[PDB]
């Protein structure tokens, strides 16, 4: 446990030990770019919830 438990993003921050990832259909950005011809029982989500990308 106490060894390597690192959860590293891009050039952001190491947040070591457990965090949250979100699978959301409602994401304002992606609704246009991807899922255009997809429903709610089959879709793609951006799990990088970073605004600047």
């Amino acid at each position: 446990t106490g060894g390597r438990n690192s959860i590293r993003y891009s050039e952001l921050a190491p947040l070591f030990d457990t965090t949250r990832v979100y699978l959301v259909d409602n994401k304002s950005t992606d609704v246009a770019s991807l899922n255009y011809q997809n429903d709610h029982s089959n879709f793609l989500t951006t799990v990088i919830q970073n605004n600047d990308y």
Partner: protein
């Protein structure tokens, strides 16, 4: 196949109209989860949890 049965779907009435989710942001306490910008824009505060 030609008309509105292909275009659309017969669902039961949703008296709620969406059942959209809300999100908690506790950002002077919780370590902002992976990917989330550490910000001061009240509109981009890191999410710690999401209820319906």
């Amino acid at each position: 196949q030609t008309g509105i049965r292909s275009w659309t779907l017969l669902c039961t009435p949703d008296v709620t109209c969406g059942s959209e989710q809300v999100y908690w942001s506790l950002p002077d306490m919780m370590q902002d989860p992976v990917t989330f910008r550490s910000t001061s824009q009240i509109s981009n505060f890191p999410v710690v949890g999401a209820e319906l």
